Design an enzyme around this catalytic site. Sequence first.
Site, PDB file in Angstrom:
ATOM      1  N   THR A  24      44.249   1.405  -8.898  1.00 13.37           N
ATOM      2  CA  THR A  24      43.843   2.433  -7.940  1.00 13.37           C
ATOM      3  C   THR A  24      43.698   3.767  -8.668  1.00 13.37           C
ATOM      4  O   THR A  24      44.483   4.075  -9.574  1.00 13.37           O
ATOM      5  CB  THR A  24      44.842   2.579  -6.755  1.00 13.37           C
ATOM      6  OG1 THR A  24      44.931   1.356  -6.007  1.00 13.37           O
ATOM      7  CG2 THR A  24      44.399   3.676  -5.804  1.00 13.37           C
ATOM      8  N   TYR A  60      40.432   1.528  -3.722  1.00 12.06           N
ATOM      9  CA  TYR A  60      40.844   1.902  -5.079  1.00 12.06           C
ATOM     10  C   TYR A  60      40.078   3.112  -5.578  1.00 12.06           C
ATOM     11  O   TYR A  60      40.485   3.727  -6.580  1.00 12.06           O
ATOM     12  CB  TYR A  60      40.652   0.759  -6.083  1.00 12.06           C
ATOM     13  CG  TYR A  60      41.376  -0.550  -5.802  1.00 12.06           C
ATOM     14  CD1 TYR A  60      42.408  -0.653  -4.853  1.00 12.06           C
ATOM     15  CD2 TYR A  60      41.005  -1.716  -6.505  1.00 12.06           C
ATOM     16  CE1 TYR A  60      43.057  -1.881  -4.620  1.00 12.06           C
ATOM     17  CE2 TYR A  60      41.646  -2.929  -6.280  1.00 12.06           C
ATOM     18  CZ  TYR A  60      42.664  -3.010  -5.345  1.00 12.06           C
ATOM     19  OH  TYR A  60      43.241  -4.254  -5.113  1.00 12.06           O
ATOM     20  N   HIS A 117      40.477  -6.473   2.868  1.00 13.32           N
ATOM     21  CA  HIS A 117      41.623  -6.035   2.016  1.00 13.32           C
ATOM     22  C   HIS A 117      42.994  -6.347   2.617  1.00 13.32           C
ATOM     23  O   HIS A 117      43.967  -6.586   1.892  1.00 13.32           O
ATOM     24  CB  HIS A 117      41.485  -4.548   1.689  1.00 13.32           C
ATOM     25  CG  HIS A 117      42.085  -4.123   0.378  1.00 13.32           C
ATOM     26  ND1 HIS A 117      43.078  -4.819  -0.281  1.00 13.32           N
ATOM     27  CD2 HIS A 117      41.821  -3.035  -0.392  1.00 13.32           C
ATOM     28  CE1 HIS A 117      43.382  -4.189  -1.410  1.00 13.32           C
ATOM     29  NE2 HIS A 117      42.637  -3.104  -1.492  1.00 13.32           N
TER      30      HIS A 117
END
Length: 299
Positions: A24, A60, A117
Amino acid sequence: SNLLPKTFRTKSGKEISIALGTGTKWKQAQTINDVSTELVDNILLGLKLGFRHIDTAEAYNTQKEVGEALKRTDVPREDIWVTTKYSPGAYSKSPSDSIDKALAQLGVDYVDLFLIHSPFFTTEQTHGYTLEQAWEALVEAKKAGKVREIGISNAAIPHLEKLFAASPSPEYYPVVNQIEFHPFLQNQSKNIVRFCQEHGILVEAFSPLAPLARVETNALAETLKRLAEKYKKTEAQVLLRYTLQRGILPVTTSSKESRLKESLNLFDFELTDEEVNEINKIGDANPYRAFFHEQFKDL
């Protein structure tokens, strides 16, 4: 294959391998690109060293960097597997807007794998989409050839159940579940690994090196040191190999040239059944979770 119980191929027909994750990237202003040189260079280098699978996510903030690397690399698009993910909580107005933004930032006309996600969102967060409705949007993207394969991250058995039910046919079943996996958390939720492998869903591991990232150490550190020294590998390599042997594709987030090379060089050794079980045992005896504690508490 003998690599994975459920496998995939790039557009050029080449079987998928270990993923280079971007990590990230924290940024102050969400609206702008703010393209990290360090990250672009790392992805370019990983591709040069032989990585052929890149893993990113809307959340990210690294899709644009992946796009830059895909432009500048000499590795053809069709030899590379690109995974990205819809963040539901959401910066995009819909899953379809997320996919278009992904195509835009990545500079591609298709992504290989597109994942929800997390199942842990409300329709307020998604701007009007349940898990089932978001799945239906992924189904549309696959039909249009924007996405080759569709799946999810951090799904438990009942989440997967919802996806199957939302699929018009078996052709549109989820085929990947990317979960937190490492010796201290061999099942992010109840029986998730065996369930996925039984139902033709490839399990991918995010944070497979959590034991090494942790400040605290237990008997696992010594086990990994011994095995590293036995095989002339690093503790990270041992963990990535362990993960592959469980039938799970690791996503690793290495940043140094030496670490990138090491992440690829996993196919010249194997852990014996005894050593895998050693890791299994010490791991289960020392449970540790790094993500989604409140969401998985009862799962």
